[PDB]
Design an enzyme around this catalytic site. Sequence first.
Site, PDB file in Angstrom:
ATOM      1  NE  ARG A 150       2.304   0.600   3.552  1.00 14.52           N
ATOM      2  CZ  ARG A 150       3.451  -0.050   3.684  1.00 14.52           C
ATOM      3  NH1 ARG A 150       3.686  -0.661   4.832  1.00 14.52           N
ATOM      4  NH2 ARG A 150       4.329  -0.143   2.677  1.00 14.52           N
ATOM      5  CD  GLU A 187      -5.610   2.678  -6.625  1.00 14.12           C
ATOM      6  OE1 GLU A 187      -6.168   1.612  -6.308  1.00 14.12           O
ATOM      7  OE2 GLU A 187      -5.554   3.667  -5.863  1.00 14.12           O
ATOM      8  CD1 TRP A 220      -7.237   9.074  -1.652  1.00 12.44           C
ATOM      9  CD2 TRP A 220      -8.216   9.210   0.360  1.00 12.44           C
ATOM     10  NE1 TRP A 220      -6.325   9.599  -0.783  1.00 12.44           N
ATOM     11  CE2 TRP A 220      -6.898   9.697   0.461  1.00 12.44           C
ATOM     12  CE3 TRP A 220      -9.029   9.199   1.505  1.00 12.44           C
ATOM     13  CZ2 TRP A 220      -6.368  10.171   1.662  1.00 12.44           C
ATOM     14  CZ3 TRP A 220      -8.511   9.669   2.696  1.00 12.44           C
ATOM     15  CH2 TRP A 220      -7.189  10.151   2.766  1.00 12.44           C
ATOM     16  CB  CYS A 280      -0.951  -0.008   1.211  1.00 11.94           C
ATOM     17  SG  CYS A 280      -2.052   1.433   1.196  1.00 11.94           S
TER      18      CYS A 280
HETATM   19  C1  HEM Z   1      -6.605   6.386   1.829  1.00  7.32           C
HETATM   20  C2  HEM Z   1      -5.775   6.265   0.766  1.00  7.32           C
HETATM   21  C3  HEM Z   1      -5.221   5.090   0.220  1.00  7.32           C
HETATM   22  C4  HEM Z   1      -4.504   5.107  -0.966  1.00  7.32           C
HETATM   23  C5  HEM Z   1      -4.257   6.338  -1.879  1.00  7.32           C
HETATM   24  C6  HEM Z   1      -4.105   3.752  -1.218  1.00  7.32           C
HETATM   25  C7  HEM Z   1      -3.494   3.322  -2.405  1.00  7.32           C
HETATM   26  C8  HEM Z   1      -3.213   1.954  -2.717  1.00  7.32           C
HETATM   27  C9  HEM Z   1      -2.662   1.450  -3.978  1.00  7.32           C
HETATM   28  C10 HEM Z   1      -2.201   2.296  -5.188  1.00  7.32           C
HETATM   29  C11 HEM Z   1      -2.629   0.113  -3.907  1.00  7.32           C
HETATM   30  C12 HEM Z   1      -2.419  -0.850  -5.029  1.00  7.32           C
HETATM   31  C13 HEM Z   1      -3.750  -1.077  -5.755  1.00  7.32           C
HETATM   32  C14 HEM Z   1      -3.650  -2.152  -6.825  1.00  7.32           C
HETATM   33  O1  HEM Z   1      -2.706  -2.066  -7.653  1.00  7.32           O
HETATM   34  O2  HEM Z   1      -4.513  -3.068  -6.825  1.00  7.32           O
HETATM   35  C15 HEM Z   1      -3.042  -0.250  -2.601  1.00  7.32           C
HETATM   36  C16 HEM Z   1      -3.002  -1.535  -2.122  1.00  7.32           C
HETATM   37  C17 HEM Z   1      -3.417  -1.935  -0.836  1.00  7.32           C
HETATM   38  N1  HEM Z   1      -3.816  -1.089   0.189  1.00  7.32           N
HETATM   39 FE1  HEM Z   1      -3.984   0.921   0.117  1.00  7.32          FE
HETATM   40  N2  HEM Z   1      -4.510   2.876  -0.161  1.00  7.32           N
HETATM   41  C18 HEM Z   1      -5.261   3.697   0.705  1.00  7.32           C
HETATM   42  C19 HEM Z   1      -6.028   3.187   1.778  1.00  7.32           C
HETATM   43  C20 HEM Z   1      -6.021   1.853   2.225  1.00  7.32           C
HETATM   44  C21 HEM Z   1      -6.685   1.435   3.417  1.00  7.32           C
HETATM   45  C22 HEM Z   1      -7.678   2.292   4.247  1.00  7.32           C
HETATM   46  C23 HEM Z   1      -6.300   0.105   3.605  1.00  7.32           C
HETATM   47  C24 HEM Z   1      -6.687  -0.814   4.577  1.00  7.32           C
HETATM   48  C25 HEM Z   1      -7.159  -0.424   5.792  1.00  7.32           C
HETATM   49  C26 HEM Z   1      -5.408  -0.226   2.541  1.00  7.32           C
HETATM   50  C27 HEM Z   1      -4.866  -1.525   2.351  1.00  7.32           C
HETATM   51  C28 HEM Z   1      -4.116  -1.945   1.243  1.00  7.32           C
HETATM   52  C29 HEM Z   1      -3.832  -3.323   0.914  1.00  7.32           C
HETATM   53  C30 HEM Z   1      -3.871  -4.590   1.815  1.00  7.32           C
HETATM   54  C31 HEM Z   1      -3.407  -3.285  -0.365  1.00  7.32           C
HETATM   55  C32 HEM Z   1      -2.889  -4.453  -1.178  1.00  7.32           C
HETATM   56  C33 HEM Z   1      -4.120  -5.221  -1.630  1.00  7.32           C
HETATM   57  C34 HEM Z   1      -3.773  -6.308  -2.622  1.00  7.32           C
HETATM   58  O3  HEM Z   1      -2.792  -7.028  -2.363  1.00  7.32           O
HETATM   59  O4  HEM Z   1      -4.475  -6.431  -3.648  1.00  7.32           O
HETATM   60  N3  HEM Z   1      -5.245   0.831   1.695  1.00  7.32           N
HETATM   61  N4  HEM Z   1      -3.418   0.880  -1.846  1.00  7.32           N
HETATM   62  N1  LIG Z   2      -6.782   2.746  -3.351  1.00  2.00           N
HETATM   63  C1  LIG Z   2      -7.090   1.492  -3.003  1.00  2.00           C
HETATM   64  N2  LIG Z   2      -6.933   0.552  -3.939  1.00  2.00           N
HETATM   65  C2  LIG Z   2      -7.246  -0.881  -3.675  1.00  2.00           C
HETATM   66  C3  LIG Z   2      -8.509  -1.275  -4.447  1.00  2.00           C
HETATM   67  C4  LIG Z   2      -8.510  -0.723  -5.894  1.00  2.00           C
HETATM   68  C5  LIG Z   2      -7.496  -1.419  -6.830  1.00  2.00           C
HETATM   69  N3  LIG Z   2      -7.393  -0.560  -8.044  1.00  2.00           N
HETATM   70  C6  LIG Z   2      -7.916  -2.867  -7.186  1.00  2.00           C
HETATM   71  O1  LIG Z   2      -8.722  -3.042  -8.111  1.00  2.00           O
HETATM   72  N4  LIG Z   2      -7.377  -3.890  -6.461  1.00  2.00           N
HETATM   73  O2  LIG Z   2      -6.470  -3.582  -5.421  1.00  2.00           O
HETATM   74  C7  LIG Z   2      -7.714  -5.382  -6.716  1.00  2.00           C
HETATM   75  C8  LIG Z   2      -7.483  -6.075  -8.089  1.00  2.00           C
HETATM   76  N5  LIG Z   2      -6.096  -6.557  -7.996  1.00  2.00           N
HETATM   77  C9  LIG Z   2      -5.712  -6.784  -6.600  1.00  2.00           C
HETATM   78  C10 LIG Z   2      -5.177  -8.212  -6.342  1.00  2.00           C
HETATM   79  N6  LIG Z   2      -4.657  -8.549  -5.173  1.00  2.00           N
HETATM   80  O3  LIG Z   2      -5.195  -9.097  -7.217  1.00  2.00           O
HETATM   81  C11 LIG Z   2      -6.978  -6.397  -5.796  1.00  2.00           C
HETATM   82  N7  LIG Z   2      -7.538   1.215  -1.794  1.00  2.00           N
HETATM   83  N8  LIG Z   2      -8.125   2.022  -0.902  1.00  2.00           N
HETATM   84  O4  LIG Z   2      -8.025   3.308  -0.968  1.00  2.00           O
HETATM   85  O5  LIG Z   2      -8.771   1.473   0.080  1.00  2.00           O
END
Ligand code: HEM
Ligand SMILES: N=C(NCCC[C@H](N)C(=O)N(O)[C@H]1CN[C@H](C(N)=O)C1)N[N+](=O)[O-]
Lengths: 407, 411
Positions: A109, A283, A278, A106
């Site tokens: 964070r 993405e 958000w 992420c």
């Molecule tokens: C608030 C702004 C946040 C931004 C801008 C952000 C952005 C991102 C981005 C760019 C990714 C990769 C998405 C992808 O390629 O599928 C990601 C992955 C992830 N984020 Fe964040 N995130 C935010 C909030 C959160 C929150 C609130 C949580 C959990 C409480 C979180 C948990 C994770 C996890 C576990 C992944 C990896 C999920 C996976 O393996 O598919 N994120 N986030």
């Molecule tokens: N900004 C956030 N992004 C997470 C969800 C949207 C992301 N584009 C997505 O489709 N994915 O993260 C999903 C599709 N591929 C991932 C996987 N493990 O295979 C999960 N989160 N967030 O702010 O809580």
Amino acid sequence: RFLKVKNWETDVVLTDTLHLKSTLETGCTEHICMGSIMLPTKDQLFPLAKEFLDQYYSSIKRFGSKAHMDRLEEVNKEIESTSTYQLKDTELIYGAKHAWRNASRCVGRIQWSKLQVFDARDCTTAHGMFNYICNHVKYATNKGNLRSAITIFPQRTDGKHDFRVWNSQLIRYAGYKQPDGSTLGDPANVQFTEICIQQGWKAPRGRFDVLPLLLQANGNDPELFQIPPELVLEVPIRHPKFDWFKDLGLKWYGLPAVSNMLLEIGGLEFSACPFSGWYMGTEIGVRDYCDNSRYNILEEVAKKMDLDMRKTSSLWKDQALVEINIAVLYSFQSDKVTIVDHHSATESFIKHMENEYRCRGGCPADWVWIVPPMSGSITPVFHQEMLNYRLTPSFEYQPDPWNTHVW
Amino acid sequence: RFLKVKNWETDVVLTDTLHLKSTLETGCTEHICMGSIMLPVRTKDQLFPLAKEFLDQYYSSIKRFGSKAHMDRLEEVNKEIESTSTYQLKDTELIYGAKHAWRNASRCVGRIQWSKLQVFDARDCTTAHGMFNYICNHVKYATNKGNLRSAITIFPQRTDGKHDFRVWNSQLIRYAGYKQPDGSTLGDPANVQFTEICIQQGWKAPRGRFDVLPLLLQANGNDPELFQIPPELVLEVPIRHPKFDWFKDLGLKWYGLPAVSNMLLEIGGLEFSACPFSGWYMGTEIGVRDYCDNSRYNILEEVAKKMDLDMRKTSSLWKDQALVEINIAVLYSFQSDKVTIVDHHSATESFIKHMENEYRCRGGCPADWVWIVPPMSGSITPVFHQEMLNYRLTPSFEYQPDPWNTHVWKG
Ligand code: HEM
Ligand SMILES: N=C(NCCC[C@H](N)C(=O)N(O)[C@H]1CN[C@H](C(N)=O)C1)N[N+](=O)[O-]
Ligand code: HEM
Ligand SMILES: N=C(NCCC[C@H](N)C(=O)N(O)[C@H]1CN[C@H](C(N)=O)C1)N[N+](=O)[O-]
Ligand SMILES: C[C@H](O)[C@H](O)[C@H]1CNc2nc(N)[nH]c(=O)c2N1
Ligand SMILES: C[C@H](O)[C@H](O)[C@H]1CNc2nc(N)[nH]c(=O)c2N1
Ligand SMILES: [Zn+2]
């Protein structure tokens, strides 16, 4: 033992010790790195609970206090009997915040400590779950001024009473295969878009049809629910120059909300824990819109721009990609929906890493996922060495329910 | 133990067995991944075994494993090793070794060309002037008036470690970098330190933004010597845009021959400390990194202004917009002058085909995702969606410390 990570653009050098506390495996060995692979008992429980409680009490400056020792014994007893335990509220919140804090993939964070936690552990039915989710969606959307949140349903018991949200995200567009052999809407959901119909959902068969929640409570079969439309904030996609852009019929939802992950705290497993923050522009603009196996809209946009798509070397795919992403960011902003560009988000992550290194002794981070899918090297994280390792509490992947559900 | 890698865009799955032959360390452990870390005098004791593995691989490749020629060779090397503490490679072995070091280079996206390497054997070289002559011939051969040909020149192997041959330059051709007293830098910031060494060694610097550096060559462990590469031998390309007439006015240009010269080539335990090699550029190396890295020529802003992009806020993606244009310019200029070059879409697509072929014909293809994926438009190139396994095989190209940090000057 004391690993160092260097940033090759600024020469900043951080030392990492936080990794020593690591406990889970990484998929890599000293002979092989699998850094780019997507998916690398009472006796078991108490040790886990102990590590957690110890880190929990250490965080509040009461390490080795009576309160500490006391709860340790209390949980200890509870496990010995119930063969499990319940987290206090304070613990549930600390655990959830830290699972996000430890999500090495992420980039957002730096926001970790502001997570709003909704305790849905008293929930019992798909209707209840649906109620909690609508509330989550409304609270988080906040009329476009998004606030991060997570809703935690009942932990696992015997694995035969698992709560699960079958959707992969609370909000996603449907995907249907047509006679043409082509795919209408979002190809990644084609299947789910069918299991919902294998349940009765009346699909409008459009390009951007918001899917129906398929909620599973305590083990029973999942049930369909349609999210109130006024709760689903959407953004029509236009360009600050190409008036023809709107004619493309593009729009995306404002709330990204992963719903298929498993939250692990003190050994406890929460199989239904949807969370949302958000979007980072890329993405949607790069992945959802331009991935070949997704909406795959690069050619069209290139056409409208009337670009020389005769030779790859004209970089028409690249030019178009840029415009598209300017359009996603532009729209969201115009409509006052929260969104962050990759430049700003990656800059935040760097500041966050520095903060984490000096306050916690490091920050697990997965370079392969942190670097944005476009303009990689012009963002600072590209030049930032990162160490990846697994810490708990954490968010993990888990089998899609439809490949484990005994109907 | 079989290992599979999946491509998530095509669902194509491949199985890896080749990694079993890996002996060196990765830098990672079961508890930590160091996949994004930049840089994660042998004795008779450790030498023959390394020689054997290599000779075994060599003889298998020619379908003569277990032959008399194979057995006698092992014997000959073994004896020679106990007799001299080292051993000489046959020409065929050297060629084979150099090609495989390239084939095993996990960070190289251009490996589909590995078997076509032209190997120049410079093991009979004794002086820096001799090194200069070999290098000039390498540059002329490889440049081939713009129709680039891959090649590598191999100088004498290390012996006792006090007689090493080394090319002090990091690339045979690179531009000088000069730190100005006001703190700004003239030319390529990446080469400031080396440029100072050159000036100190006697080079009369022209102090411009693109001065081709002199060669600083070390033969047999002696103090390095300076040499100027004949200009007629250095092919360069003026950079202009197929639509922005002012682009040419930025006064940008780059050389056509990328030639790493500071790596160490390991073959059957032997160490070749001076082994310059060259192929041809992939656009983004110049367009994205050399021109736009904040720590390199850093031209994003100047190009940004000229385009009149809204630079008030990053979300305008003015940096991203300028980047594409600059990369279009680089590709355009090279193609117009008929100097070999390949775009990232094309190069990455070739690597996927090369990779699939390697899994099937060799059982694997070590690859470093962090380096294979291009510095721009990552996910619109097929490699982004491709799972990869990184492991170390020999023959190999290794990093080695900068010589000015280890060299015992004689005076
Ligand atoms: C608030 C702004 C946040 C931004 C801008 C952000 C952005 C991102 C981005 C760019 C990714 C990769 C998405 C992808 O390629 O599928 C990601 C992955 C992830 N984020 Fe964040 N995130 C935010 C909030 C959160 C929150 C609130 C949580 C959990 C409480 C979180 C948990 C994770 C996890 C576990 C992944 C990896 C999920 C996976 O393996 O598919 N994120 N986030
Ligand atoms: N900004 C956030 N992004 C997470 C969800 C949207 C992301 N584009 C997505 O489709 N994915 O993260 C999903 C599709 N591929 C991932 C996987 N493990 O295979 C999960 N989160 N967030 O702010 O809580
Ligand atoms: C035919 C043209 C070739 C292309 C288009 C190609 C392209 C590339 C690119 C893009 C990189 C990354 C460079 C960087 O980002 O700094 C690379 C790395 C590498 N290539 Fe190739 N390459 C080619 C030929 C060669 C040849 C002939 C060899 C050796 C025989 C070679 C050996 C390597 C090595 C050892 C690395 C990594 C170097 C390092 O870690 O600094 N390449 N190549
Ligand atoms: N197309 C080829 N590219 C490799 C050499 C040029 C590269 N852009 C570069 O400056 N470098 O690779 C150098 C600068 N950074 C690298 C490092 N480890 O720090 C070395 N090769 N080839 O065709 O033989
Ligand atoms: C195969 C490779 O690991 C895969 O394509 C990864 C690369 N980096 C990624 N990075 C992010 N943020 N999200 C992804 O889905 C991926 N996919
Ligand atoms: C820190 C990070 O490993 C480093 O910046 C790497 C990333 N990927 C790269 N990829 C290529 N081709 N070349 C590089 O110099 C780098 N630098
Ligand atoms: Zn690893």
